[PDB]
Amino acid sequence: HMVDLRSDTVTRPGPAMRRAMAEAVVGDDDYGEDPTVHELQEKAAELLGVERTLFVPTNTMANLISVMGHCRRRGSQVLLGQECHLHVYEQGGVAQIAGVHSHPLPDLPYGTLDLNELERALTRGSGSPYHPVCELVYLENTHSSAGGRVLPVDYLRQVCLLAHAHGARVHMDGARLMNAAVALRIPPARLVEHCDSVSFCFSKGLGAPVGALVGGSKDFIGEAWRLRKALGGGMRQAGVLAAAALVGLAEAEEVLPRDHENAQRFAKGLQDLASPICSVDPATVETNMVLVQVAGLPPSELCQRLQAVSAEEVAQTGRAVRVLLFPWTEQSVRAVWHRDVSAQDTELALKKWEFVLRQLRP
Amino acid sequence: HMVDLRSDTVTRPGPAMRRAMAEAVVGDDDYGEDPTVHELQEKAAELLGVERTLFVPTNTMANLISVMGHCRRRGSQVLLGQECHLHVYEQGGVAQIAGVHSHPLPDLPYGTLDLNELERALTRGSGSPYHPVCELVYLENTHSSAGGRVLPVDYLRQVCLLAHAHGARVHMDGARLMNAAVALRIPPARLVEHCDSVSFCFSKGLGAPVGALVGGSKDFIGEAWRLRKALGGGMRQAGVLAAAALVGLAEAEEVLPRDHENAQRFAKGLQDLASPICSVDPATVETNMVLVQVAGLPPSELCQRLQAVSAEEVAQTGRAVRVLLFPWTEQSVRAVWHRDVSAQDTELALKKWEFVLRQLRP
Amino acid sequence: HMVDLRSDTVTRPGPAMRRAMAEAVVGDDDYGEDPTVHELQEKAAELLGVERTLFVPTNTMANLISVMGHCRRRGSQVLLGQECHLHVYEQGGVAQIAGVHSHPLPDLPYGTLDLNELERALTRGSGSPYHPVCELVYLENTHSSAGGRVLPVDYLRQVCLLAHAHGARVHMDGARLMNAAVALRIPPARLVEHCDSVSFCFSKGLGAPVGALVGGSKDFIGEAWRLRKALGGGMRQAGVLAAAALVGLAEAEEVLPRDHENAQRFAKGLQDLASPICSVDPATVETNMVLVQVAGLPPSELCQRLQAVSAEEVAQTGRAVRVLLFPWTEQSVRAVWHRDVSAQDTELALKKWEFVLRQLRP
Amino acid sequence: HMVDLRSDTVTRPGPAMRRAMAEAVVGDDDYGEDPTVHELQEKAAELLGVERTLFVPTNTMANLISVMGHCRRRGSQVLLGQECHLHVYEQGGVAQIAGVHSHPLPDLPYGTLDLNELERALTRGSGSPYHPVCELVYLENTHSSAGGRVLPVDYLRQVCLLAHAHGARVHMDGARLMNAAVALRIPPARLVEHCDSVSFCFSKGLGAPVGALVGGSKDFIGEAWRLRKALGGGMRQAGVLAAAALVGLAEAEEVLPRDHENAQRFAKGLQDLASPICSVDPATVETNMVLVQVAGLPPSELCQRLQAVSAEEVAQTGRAVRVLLFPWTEQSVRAVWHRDVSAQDTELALKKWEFVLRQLRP
């Protein structure tokens, strides 16, 4: 048996999604003739509170388009977090493709940036010609590398006040924005109100196979089209993909709460083991991610043992469960939940974790 | 009734394709865990005679990845045609994204480049440090802007001899490579043998909704992966799209011959009208495209009249056919055939053309 | 004896220039505290009829700054000539540094672009989002590769009318602008009136060791400063160089006429030889350059023989003159005059040419 | 009277330098025909222990060329300090020109990078294709923003061991490398032994008006030539500037010690005042810079008062000294010494500082 908690991107299409793709009404999106893509873009615009949206192949391209759309001036700068996904896991595309300078600030704690450090940075070269012009403050909600932490609304409000005062825009990587809205029990628009543009990903917790989009004003999306075209994201009959994304958008408020509960149950379960090797504070499990601190064992070996199966596992547990995880830091692993991990899969992953921990107990 | 000959990208998925998408076995392609994508990449590699292939969202990204993969040296240059699709209809991405210099040579005649001009250009800065280093010769087969002209094998052989002598690679934009192979009645590999890398598009004549790929050696595709990632083409469960592309690849040798026949029938039909306004040489209709020369009427108005319907059309023709076309040059329009244009649609488009021509006859 | 006609860049500083450098009042130009640089920028602004000017190290950087200043929009395009210096002999910097697309048009004939082809190109993607936006028309006066041909004022007037109608700017590479003004016997401002920005080079015919500048409006030069800084052209005590440039600017109207006369004398002299190997039309020698057509001998060997000295040369000529020249095309060489080539040096170069031609006469 | 301690770039040429420029033997450097430039490049290569050197207009271009020379791979990364000059005061050229990603690490303390953080960063994506490839570790000696701190030899040795193990090169911004060599009383080559390439600036403490250069192997300088050309640093008769740089290179070991003594005298003098507003630890004044901590007064106003002159200054001091300084941080100012600040100017600047401090004493 397999329980894959490496990422929520591994979500596979359900039967309602598979039917929607085979029954999609499509056209050439490059000509603006795909009705299902237009339906997705209009519904997502209403959900996010933006004027327009633009369907793209990946959330990577959506972030890259947004940065290029705000930071067009030669000698522009993005203020972002040093552990945000754009700065670490996107090939440095801000530089090698957008040609924009990046100024990273510490964000590990709770995915938030120190408002004092952010103000000092926004003021350093706010008018001096010797410094690059900060045209964008880049935010990520939820913050992936911090464990799926939720950015509060008031923090988002303070960032926009600080950015819009120094003549900068605000973009929010909302690759897991619905995970944040459900955690706060607020409509997603309340978070997007405090930003100029937003990314939104269907291929993670929502369960769609392919797709993301850029949200913003008409003018910003108007120029996002040319950038999508130049990067090679201007597909033809994309309504096949948008049909599946429409299904996941409707099931979001019902599917995502179960991912948060399963992650919280796992964190509480690991805590109830009182192991001197693994330590988790369930109060830090805000969404679908659990960061487990490891001691005395390299995190890679913990993932290797949890993925392997032994005859003694079948003895003291009963089942043979292969738990898939990623080593995150030098002293921690990361578990991500999604709709293909059932609550019974979660209990089985807890039992595998008990067995592995016991077989190496100091 | 609608007969859309603007482009072969408007092909809509058939029932076999719609079923394949709903029945696709998928995984995360970013982890290399989608079996249907791997099946498409292996079959296409055997079809094209390359070591590996890499599925991408669009043929635009496939060309951009190839140029970036060959022209990485700072101060690199691409030798290409001044009417090739990359140089005209791709937002100048060779420059604004790849940062590579372009040297266009005349290609309008038959999509071919003068081998003397190509040799003189390859020799100008072949060793001088004052000139950019030519690292790629860019070819397009079939050539779109010239009317779908087929590049002969011997011409491809001479280009590689000239390019590989001066230390340059050869990439072939094969957005309509199967249209060329069927026209020559040869396996597609015979054309790809004379190039280092190749693009291949499923979303045109093959009929798939979304998808293209890069073909080449293992090492070239190995680095194409990082470039696909940075540009935002690294999708997750792309096996949904690759399932439809596998169907069109199997129906290619049976679907494309009908597109060439319908285009040839139309060109002969227009010729049998002997109109002093429209003139076509059917000998120039090598694939699925027909360039119609217009006189005394702006090509935009000809497209407007062919798209419109009048009561007199219903009189002298019987049916109300809306023929969709694009104005190509200042004195010509362009018609492109595909599997959604039936042979009976072709005859109806001929009758609409007769009516329009007669109602403005000088 | 050496007569170096390879280029007019080989001009060495005179005693008045050497004194001006040692007596220059200088400061930190980066702080705007060098008075001699400010004096040069103000005098050149009055000479060219622009609002401001910005001293730069090379004419290469001046052209690169101008292109970057006009073509900042992502997906911008420059319309230029396929034999202009920017497109051929500047490492493709428009692409690898500015990230701008280039659309070259034929200019070899007389350094001019066909106004019909220029209008058809400016109209192709003037409003379509599928094409790059043409934001600059790039002109070169005098045109180097064509033999120092002068662009007429009326042609410059027609280009601006055509460019400013389609929302594009006009930049003029005036690396040899004074050579054109003296040829037309008009103030240099009459040429710059028909452009938005201009380059101007002191290190060629004017005789300065180092220096060039960008001319334009206050706002354009204001942003040219940031670009000069980013490229590494923001020098400190540049008044040392600007002092020598001020001397050459004052001697221009007296030094350059002698270069045109010496070149014209050489062209007439070569014609009076009636050789079936070398042919020049003196009517094509508009400035300080002479293109000599060669037959039966590779142009490289002609340069080798003219540079070499034999005992038979000392016999039938009397002196041993080493004439330095560059092979230009496959059938032509290029001679460029400057202030370090005296009129007596010109006669000696004619005699060397007679001897070489006679010793291989068919 | 003026005492300008804003920067050491304000050094003006001396009479020996002014004579050297007027007596320089020059040629076209673009053709490699300037003997004085070749003399400077050979002497500097012997001084630095590198194979070749390449004269450039500014130290900004020298750093930009080096980064571009090492980080050519698409998706390359530079590891540097977040307060190094390249990352803060160079328009973000690593991004907007070189297209390279930057990973800044904390360096403020002593200009050094934590070897553990540097190892963790070099190991994160050392082999993973999901991360950019670190091809350069960027060091600055002396570190400007930290107060001219000297990087020890052993630290340089440990950085190269760590960088060369993970397949990265090491470049050292030696804008003030001679200030470090004199401080350590070691030949400059001992520092350059622990790097692959080096920058070296003549226009600061050495006193030359214009000039810098890149040092490295033959192959690295060979490609630096093409990059210098593309950026517009390929000057013609640069031997005018190289003659002055040769004079400053010979006077370095005699001029720079006086700048360190004057700075140390000032730091001790300010300390002997025991003011609760200004505080300096003379042990932190390693070279020609003094960072003065300010309290109760914004650093801009302290610079304003020290620059202004009052009748009460002429009373209690005797002279009217205008001390020029830059505000550095929110709580500190920065003073930089050079050969145009005499030791008697230093004492006068101390007396002005006493007067200003006393007139606002809490």
Author numbering:
A (entry chain A), B (entry chain A), C (entry chain A), D (entry chain A): 39 to 400
Give verbatim lines from the article:
Tha1 did not rank highest based on the AlphaFold model, but its rank improved to second place using the experimental crystal structure we determined at 2.26 Å resolution. The PLP cofactor is visible only in the monoclinic structure; however, the active site is very similar in the two cases, with only minor differences. The expected tetrameric quaternary structure is formed by crystallographic symmetries, with four identical units in F222 (related by a 222 symmetry) and two identical dimers in C2 (related by a two-fold axis). Also the tetrameric assembly is conserved in the two space groups, with two main interfaces. As indicate by data from PISA analysis, the interface between units A and B (analogous to that between units C and D, termed “main interface”) is contributing stronger to the stability of the quaternary structure in comparison with the interface between units A and C (analogous to that between units B and D, termed “secondary interface”). Hence, the tetramer can be considered a dimer (AB + CD) of dimers (A + B and C + D), with the first dissociation being ABCD to AB + CD (as determined by PISA). Interestingly, the Tha1 ranking in our screening greatly improved by using the crystal structure of the mouse protein or AlphaFold models built taking this information into account.
However, the preferred substrate of Tha1 is HTML with a catalytic efficiency in the order of 104 s−1 M−1, followed by L-allo-threonine (102 s−1 M−1) and L-threonine (101 s−1 M−1). As we found that the mouse enzyme has a strong preference (1000 folds) for HTML towards threonine, the name hydroxytrimethyllysine aldolase (Htmla) would be a better descriptor of the mouse gene.
